[PDB]
Symmetry: C3
Subunit: 282 residues, 3 copies
């Protein structure tokens, strides 16, 4: 497999955006979970529907419509993705990660990724926020990788390292900010594992995922982090623990989509003020 986008494609899209807005973001945020409401706190916001931006992959976002929003959040200029793309919709990883490279060409230096995730770690409770310290890329093990194919030297090297993908200083700042918020629940931190989806895991799969050392499971984010790190973007991210995974055959029930949506709704306010405060420390 080879990326279908030439360097010029990215550049054209970037040039189109610059000629249609006066905003010049330094931070890019890919919203997941109940963070979709974060667009409501931007100043001087300007919205672009994914369908009107050349080369942008078609939208297929549930709940939060596919919009790219520019604006000032807590004194910082940023651009946000309201709705992202997932492999389970049929998109190749090179379409999924297309926005990350455009962000780089706009002058962006920092990327914040957020998502909803199932809790594998027995100590996580619904509503918990887990800073992503590391990740396990299952699709990557089989070759499914956004960097597969010839390397574009103008973006980065052939063999980029990922052991330092999640910025250390960012996670330090995140802990201080959380303390300053006077939260009773502590800020979690752990390993996120991505798998394809769209179906939810079985008990047997959840037990091995946990045995492999993962704390949370999800169907996104990893390909974006890989491409971001490839082109030199400082990356920071976190998962909203939307549900605890069923790990015993005496299943009290089963993970459902309404459950995760509710969680995203109930924690929205907490996630928004958190990301807003973090802007001041980037």
């Amino acid at each position: 497999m080879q990326n279908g986008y030439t360097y010029e494609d990215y550049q054209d899209t970037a040039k189109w955006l610059l000629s249609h807005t006066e905003q010049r973001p330094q931070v890019a945020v890919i919203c997941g979970s109940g963070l979709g409401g974060l667009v409501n706190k931007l100043t001087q916001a300007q919205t672009f529907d994914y369908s009107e931006i050349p080369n942008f992959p078609e939208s297929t976002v549930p709940g939060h419509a596919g919009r790219l929003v520019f604006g000032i959040l807590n004194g910082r200029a940023c651009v946000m993705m309201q709705g992202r793309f997932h492999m389970y919709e049929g998109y190749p990883f090179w379409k999924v990660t297309f926005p990350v490279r455009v962000f780089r060409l706009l002058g962006v230096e920092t990327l914040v990724v957020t998502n909803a995730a199932g809790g594998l770690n027995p100590n996580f409770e619904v509503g918990d926020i887990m800073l992503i310290r590391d990740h396990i890329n299952l699709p990557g093990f089989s070759g499914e990788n956004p960097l597969r194919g010839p390397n574009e030297e103008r973006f980065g090297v052939r063999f980029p390292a990922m052991s330092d993908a999640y910025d250390r200083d960012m996670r330090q700042k995140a802990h201080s900010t959380w303390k300053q918020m006077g939260e009773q629940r502590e800020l979690q931190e752990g390993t996120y594992v991505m798998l394809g989806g769209p179906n939810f895991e079985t008990v047997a799969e959840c037990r091995l995922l946990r045995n492999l050392g993962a704390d949370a499971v999800g169907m996104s984010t990893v390909p974006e982090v890989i491409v971001a790190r490839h082109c030199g973007l400082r990356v920071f991210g976190f998962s909203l623990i939307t549900n605890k995974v069923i790990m015993d055959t005496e299943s009290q029930g089963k993970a459902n989509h309404e459950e995760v949506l509710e969680a995203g709704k109930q924690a929205a306010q907490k996630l928004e003020q958190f990301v807003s405060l973090l802007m001041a420390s980037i």
Copy 2:
């Protein structure tokens, strides 16, 4: 990747079958192992070669020729697949699972899946029958999934759960029936793990498969169970332990295809009467 079959394709195939047979099955059986002979016990059987049914994937079945057989088994009306499709032949998962959706549109409510498998659990002996209680989907981890691409709402939801894939009541009935058969060997039950194939595993791979909690290994069934559960089919299945996997470098030999064929042959009669008795309890 996206499924190449539109909902209408499935419906056309279903409509063609209904206009060519008076049979109206409630149960669908996908035969594997030595269960291929089960067609010999149907009453009022009517056979359809896969090649004469519109939209049906081309046949590539070894030993048992690709036929779709309708008939009455122990008083119940059912349809059976004599030979299935495997990813290792080159078929995408959406071709492999095509029959499952057609079955749904015919009015079928229950699906019984059977296969041959290598024993990972040290307590299994050749000839053992293992009820499938749960599964581990390795291809699914990388995104290889029959549901990949846009979701067809007329079949099911975007994020179906799989923790309850193998019907509980069915497995209870299976245990009672086995007792009533006066078998000396006990009915096994466990986790089946699917991988792509077509080559057999190495010692190192078998040890990790076992460490991951799998009891039996095979190259099929899982994609069919996923699609079946997606559209609301009650699923029940079992593996015929055709051989015990080599797990030490002092390999007494190596898994071979003739070995598995022999096992399927020697247990044929036992599997047939078992599935026949189960019909009375569905």
Copy 3:
């Protein structure tokens, strides 16, 4: 997926080579690591650029240019691949493994595979040579396999076993030869695990790889061993431990490509005399 090469394609390429050289090799060597210099010790060498050989996949080799070299090494006639293909470049496994089948049709009976690898086993030091005793094929778990699609009976069987892939007698000879070289460091031996790449692993991924029982990690060799064993080639291989993987968050640094190149350079002489001596015992 299905192999795009017909049996005749392989045969044509083989026939073209035979009509352009008088050499008739019995051993084929696929050079990796600092073994790229091994071509300098061939007698009566004759070089073919991959681009001039019909049907040969396009070259994309870093450092060592894609050449196929025929010659006599320590009294034995052999053919060597200076530079191989990797999935991470965009090649399907059937393009990657194309040379292995051509080698078979030339009359070759033995294949020696070498590569660079990251050390997972805590006892390995940079510069170590690890005989490959077994392998773990992650891409294979998801269906990514060079044998996927219809089986070509003229090459081998539908379900080949892999538990005996690495020749036992070859590894015995390798140990004797190493002793005869009077090396202070002992010859290592272990399980190689392949993943897609091109990015390097994260700490979390390295810990699970090690927990799964792997000793060394790399991005090649496995598909070639599978196809070789399929067509009846005696296989022998080893990894040059070019670096030790970062397995703690207090990362002293991070794996980089220059590091691995340096290692390949520093051990070149030792690998060359080793492979040269082994020729005398094949």
